[PDB]
Amino acid sequence: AASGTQNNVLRGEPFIRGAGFISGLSYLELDNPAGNKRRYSAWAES
């Protein structure tokens, strides 16, 4: 008899306060923990 249990839960809540570009950094957190350099520069310009 063999039994295996797998359980992994990872949740992120980015806060990017760039009015329209604020949602980009929040949506990019899905599977991408590191922030995009180009997206970060765009948010800084915003």
Next chain:
Amino acid sequence: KSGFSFGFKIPGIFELGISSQSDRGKHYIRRTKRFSHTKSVFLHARSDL
């Protein structure tokens, strides 16, 4: 397995011989197996701008 034989003869033849053999064997087998696996993924997303 079991076997028995008996023989007796005396002259006055006269001769007599009796043999008996009985064999019996039984084999029984049984195999049962069950496998069950459950996989559930729940993802919730909420974003406000």
